[PDB]
């Protein structure tokens, strides 16, 4: 079982130019209309790739995939080519060449595209870390400003909170889904559990609301370990990131609004100094 | 906090693990349960987060007793030890940080007294719809945190305005707003105060500080008197010719009234000549239809053509009016003897110098 | 201010200050950095600016030696006898 042939390759993958590095440098910032379309078309194809992983959940984790087959698989590879040609230009176009080595937008792509470009030479497919591409959904609020719907920054912060909520929720659900599909290495993968992705999303939404039914639960010890770490990470996200931002969406105005002009009610307006005694 | 959390969690997990491994003495240890320690740690982490799956649970009555006492002890630890300490790690600073120096964004730093009334007119006639090529990001810097009305005002101009908290006397605060590279810094002043020599000399102090940091910046300030404006020529780094200019509210505000006493209504002209105002096309034959045909006229400065050199001033006004429909209000005459002095409606005796 | 028989920059002055981070403004000549130790500041070194806050250091120096204060008080006040 060559699951480690993809994961270890991903780990080892993780392990005159001054005028061409800035040819797309205007296209990075929101300065031209052309610089918009690059982030828009890496985001829409990220949505499309995420759909394939959602469909992939039904399929077995390890399978043989050739070149002349179902066109979803064939266009997935072209999506991966477009992805690598998208974020490959920013290795030299980045000002800092140090923090790109641990960037969250770079680690998310170190683990998806190199398994595919090794698996082309292998003509196979394993259900790898393809759930990670929902982490690009944090770039949703970037591109919803450009369509001129988000203009009030309170709406932009609301979209940011909902995007990071849904992205963390779907990412952790995909991770624990991948863990619970396979078994345990020290038990030699004899302790699997059959979970659809929608039931797994049901699990990690029941969990982060502190309800805890138990109709679906983790059975792998490696899965229980990730649940222990993830409820603490969810509370650390809940106690330190949201609870002041929730209170920013909690200042409701006491005495605002207007008068409802009910007919037959000649409303006397009384103004000037107003006190209980007067 | 993390150490006492992990220590209490592992200690109670070990205790309930020892209880659930053995049975019950009154049942003569016939009611054991086989639990690994990692599953037991899973149990007492699921418990203290109030999730409660039930895939692993206590089956000994002595274990259930310890769980009943331990959730109350966990809440007593949670309601009396942490919840003030969590709030000590919850005071996030509102307006701190620095400015991100985006290229092509000459960030104007505006400091001095900042209020909704003073800033609003300035923001309304600065960030106006009818400007040409505004790529300029206003950076306010002021020590008093704003009220809710300024929050609503800054939320309206989200893409152009950044506020920051702090003085303009600490040079670290000037380092935060990137004052070293900026097109210019404008210091505002209050329209009213108890003593005008308070805010006059305070703005002079702010000019001293900003020129002390970076001596090559344009500063457009405000004053409240005229006899306090001579303290700006005091500074050696202050060059008016370089474009550092001071606008005196008293001289202009109560000079416009004086010139209006001559010509009834000059204040309306000289206020609509410089405010970037929106033309509204009025079809109906009202007085506004004739009024708004002069509001859209503004003032510009321009070098002259070489063909105008040597001629007389009414001749060049006649050519600029009939030929190009442009009114030349005044010219600048520069001589070695004296600093160039603007002359308005210069007489025919004065002729044009080259350039 | 300027005069004839010169420029008023040669006039010896001492001003009292009330802040440490306020002394750099007295000196027209350029300094290496805005963040300069008060002792290293050009105006303090010249002795044209007396900050009031350096007297707060003397309470340290009076702590470690009982005789610093009487030395300064007899050196400066000119025989401040009890």
Curated annotation (Swiss-Prot), chain B:
Short motif Selectivity for potassium, span: 50-53
TM stretches of this protein: 1-19, 66-86
Outcome, altering residue 216 to N: Found in a patient with epileptic encephalopathy; uncertain significance; no effect on voltage-dependent sensitivity
Start and end residues of each stretch annotated as Segment S7: 254-274
UniProt modification remark: Phosphorylated. Phosphorylation by kinases such as PKA and/or PKG. In smooth muscles, phosphorylation affects its activity. Palmitoylation by ZDHHC22 and ZDHHC23 within the intracellular linker between the S0 and S1 transmembrane domains regulates localization to the plasma membrane. Depalmitoylated by LYPLA1 and LYPLAL1, leading to retard exit from the trans-Golgi network.
Intramembrane residue numbers: 34-56
Effect annotated for changing residue 354 to A: Found in a patient with epilepsy; uncertain significance; no effect on voltage-dependent sensitivity
Positions that bind Mg(2+): 137, 160, 162
Tissue expression as described in the entry: Widely expressed. Except in myocytes, it is almost ubiquitously expressed.
Residue intervals of the RCK N-terminal domain: 105-247
Residue ranges that the UniProt entry lists as topological domain Extracellular: 20-33, 57-65
Subcellular localization, as worded in the UniProt entry: Cell membrane
Region (Segment S8): 311-331
Disulfide bonds: none
Protein task: Potassium channel activated by both membrane depolarization or increase in cytosolic Ca(2+) that mediates export of K(+). It is also activated by the concentration of cytosolic Mg(2+). Its activation dampens the excitatory events that elevate the cytosolic Ca(2+) concentration and/or depolarize the cell membrane. It therefore contributes to repolarization of the membrane potential.
Other noteworthy facts: The protein was initially thought to contain two functionally distinct parts: The core channel (from the N-terminus to the S9 segment) that mediates the channel activity, and the cytoplasmic tail (from the S9 segment to the C-terminus) that mediates the calcium sensing. The situation is however more complex, since the core channel also contains binding sites for Ca(2+) and Mg(2+).
Similarity annotation: Belongs to the potassium channel family. Calcium-activated (TC 1.A.1.3) subfamily. KCa1.1/KCNMA1 sub-subfamily.
Disease: Paroxysmal non-kinesigenic dyskinesia 3 with or without generalized epilepsy: An autosomal dominant neurologic disorder characterized by absence seizures, generalized tonic-clonic seizures, paroxysmal nonkinesigenic dyskinesia and involuntary dystonic or choreiform movements. Onset is usually in childhood. Patients may have seizures only, dyskinesia only, or both.
Subunit structure: Homotetramer; which constitutes the calcium-activated potassium channel. Interacts with RAB11B. Interacts with beta subunits KCNMB1, KCNMB2, KCNMB3 and KCNMB4. Interacts with gamma subunits LRRC26, LRRC38, LRRC52 and LRRC55. Beta and gamma subunits are accessory, and modulate its activity.
Protein name listed in UniProt: Calcium-activated potassium channel subunit alpha-1
Organism of provenance: Homo sapiens
Span within the parent record: 303 to 657 of 1236
Swiss-Prot record, chain C:
Post-translational modification as stated in the protein's UniProt record: Phosphorylated. Phosphorylation by kinases such as PKA and/or PKG. In smooth muscles, phosphorylation affects its activity. Palmitoylation by ZDHHC22 and ZDHHC23 within the intracellular linker between the S0 and S1 transmembrane domains regulates localization to the plasma membrane. Depalmitoylated by LYPLA1 and LYPLAL1, leading to retard exit from the trans-Golgi network.
Region (Segment S10): 44-64
Effect listed in the UniProt record for changing residue 65 to S: In PNKD3 and EIG16; increased sensitivity to voltage-dependent activation resulting in increased channel activity; no change in calcium sensitivity
Organism superkingdom: Eukaryota
Entry's family note: Belongs to the potassium channel family. Calcium-activated (TC 1.A.1.3) subfamily. KCa1.1/KCNMA1 sub-subfamily.
Note: The protein was initially thought to contain two functionally distinct parts: The core channel (from the N-terminus to the S9 segment) that mediates the channel activity, and the cytoplasmic tail (from the S9 segment to the C-terminus) that mediates the calcium sensing. The situation is however more complex, since the core channel also contains binding sites for Ca(2+) and Mg(2+).
Disease in which the protein is involved: Paroxysmal non-kinesigenic dyskinesia 3 with or without generalized epilepsy: An autosomal dominant neurologic disorder characterized by absence seizures, generalized tonic-clonic seizures, paroxysmal nonkinesigenic dyskinesia and involuntary dystonic or choreiform movements. Onset is usually in childhood. Patients may have seizures only, dyskinesia only, or both. Epilepsy, idiopathic generalized 16: An autosomal dominant form of idiopathic generalized epilepsy, a disorder characterized by recurring generalized seizures in the absence of detectable brain lesions and/or metabolic abnormalities. Generalized seizures arise diffusely and simultaneously from both hemispheres of the brain. Seizure types include juvenile myoclonic seizures, absence seizures, and generalized tonic-clonic seizures. EIG16 is characterized by onset of seizures soon after birth or in the first years of life.
Described purpose of this protein according to its UniProt entry: Potassium channel activated by both membrane depolarization or increase in cytosolic Ca(2+) that mediates export of K(+). It is also activated by the concentration of cytosolic Mg(2+). Its activation dampens the excitatory events that elevate the cytosolic Ca(2+) concentration and/or depolarize the cell membrane. It therefore contributes to repolarization of the membrane potential.
Protein name: Calcium-activated potassium channel subunit alpha-1
Coverage span on the entire protein: 953 to 1070 of 1236
């Amino acid at each position: 079982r060559m699951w480690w042939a993809f994961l270890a390759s991903s780990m080892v993958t993780f392990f005159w130019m001054t005028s061409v590095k800035d040819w797309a440098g205007v296209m990075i910032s929101a300065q031209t209309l052309t610089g918009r379309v690059l982030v828009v078309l890496v985001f829409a194809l990220s949505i499309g790739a995420l759909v394939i992983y959602f469909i992939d959940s039904s399929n077995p984790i390890e399978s043989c995939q050739n070149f002349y087959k179902d066109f979803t698989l064939q266009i997935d590879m072209a999506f991966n080519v477009f992805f690598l040609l998208y974020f490959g230009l920013r290795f030299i176009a980045a000002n800092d060449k140090l923090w790109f080595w641990l960037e969250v937008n770079s680690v998310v792509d170190f683990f998806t595209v190199p398994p595919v470009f090794v698996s082309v030479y292998l003509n196979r497919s394993w259900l790898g870390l393809r759930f990670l591409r929902a982490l690009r959904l944090i770039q949703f609020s970037e591109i919803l400003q450009f369509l001129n719907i988000l203009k009030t920054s309170n709406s932009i912060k609301l979209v940011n909170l909902l995007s990071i909520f849904i992205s963390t929720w779907l990412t952790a659900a995909g991770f624990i889904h991948l863990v619970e599909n396979s078994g345990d290495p020290w038990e030699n993968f004899q302790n699997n559990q059959a979970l659809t992705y929608w039931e797994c999303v049901y699990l990690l939404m029941v969990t982060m609301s502190t309800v805890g039914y138990g109709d679906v639960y983790a059975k792998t010890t490696l899965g229980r370990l990730f649940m222990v770490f993830f409820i603490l990470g969810g509370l650390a996200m809940f106690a330190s990131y949201v609870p002041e931002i929730i209170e920013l969406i909690g200042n409701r105005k006491k005495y605002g609004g207007s008068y409802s002009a009910v007919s037959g009610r000649k409303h006397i307006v009384v103004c000037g100094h107003i006190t209980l005694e007067s | 906090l993390l150490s006492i959390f992990i220590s209490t969690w592992l200690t109670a997990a070990g205790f309930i693990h020892l209880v659930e491994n053995s049975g019950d003495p009154w049942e003569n240890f016939q009611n054991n349960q086989a639990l690994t320690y990692w599953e037991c740690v899973y149990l007492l982490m699921v418990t203290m987060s109030t999730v409660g799956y039930g895939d692993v649970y206590a089956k000994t009555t002595l274990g259930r007793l310890f769980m009943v006492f331990f959730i109350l002890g966990g809440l007593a630890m949670f309601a009396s030890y942490v919840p003030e300490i969590i709030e000590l790690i919850g005071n996030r600073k509102k307006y701190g940080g620095s400015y991100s120096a985006v290229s092509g964004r000459k960030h104007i730093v505006v400091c001095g007294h900042i209020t909704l009334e003073s800033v609003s007119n300035f923001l309304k006639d600065f960030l106006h719809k009818d400007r040409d090529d505004v790529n300029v990001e206003i950076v306010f810097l002021h020590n008093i945190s704003p009220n809710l009305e300024l929050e609503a005002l800054f939320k309206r101009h989200f893409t152009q305005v950044e506020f920051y908290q702090g003085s303009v006397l600490n040079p670290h605060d000037l380092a935060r707003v990137k004052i070293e590279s900026a097109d210019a810094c404008l210091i505002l002043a209050n329209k009213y105060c108890a003593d005008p020599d308070a805010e006059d000399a305070s703005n002079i102090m702010r000019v001293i500080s900003i020129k002390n940091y970076h001596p090559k910046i344009r500063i457009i300030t405000q004053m409240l008197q005229y006899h306090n404006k001579a303290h700006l020529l005091n500074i050696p780094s202050w060059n008016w010719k370089e474009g550092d200019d001071a606008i005196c509210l008293a001289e202009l505000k109560l000079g416009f009234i004086a010139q209006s006493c001559l010509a009834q209504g000059l204040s309306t002209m000289l206020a609509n000549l410089f405010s970037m105002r929106s033309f509204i096309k009025i079809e109906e034959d009202t007085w506004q239809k004739y009024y708004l045909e002069g509001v859209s006229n503004e003032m510009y400065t321009e070098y002259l053509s070489s063909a105008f050199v040597g001629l007389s001033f009414p001749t060049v006004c006649e050519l600029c009016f009939v030929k190009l429909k442009l009114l030349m209000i005044a010219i600048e005459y520069k001589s070695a003897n004296r600093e160039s002095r603007i002359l308005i409606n210069p007489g025919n005796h004065l002729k044009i110098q080259e350039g | 201010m300027q005069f004839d028989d010169t420029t008023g920059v040669n006039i010896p002055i001492i001003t009292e200050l009330v802040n440490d981070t306020n002394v750099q403004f007295l000196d027209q000549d350029d300094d290496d950095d805005p963040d300069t130790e008060l002792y290293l500041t050009q105006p303090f070194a010249c002795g044209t600016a007396f900050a009031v806050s350096v007297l707060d250091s003397l309470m340290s120096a009076t702590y470690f030696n009982d005789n610093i204060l009487t030395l300064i008080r007899t050196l400066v006040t000119g025989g401040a006898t009890p």
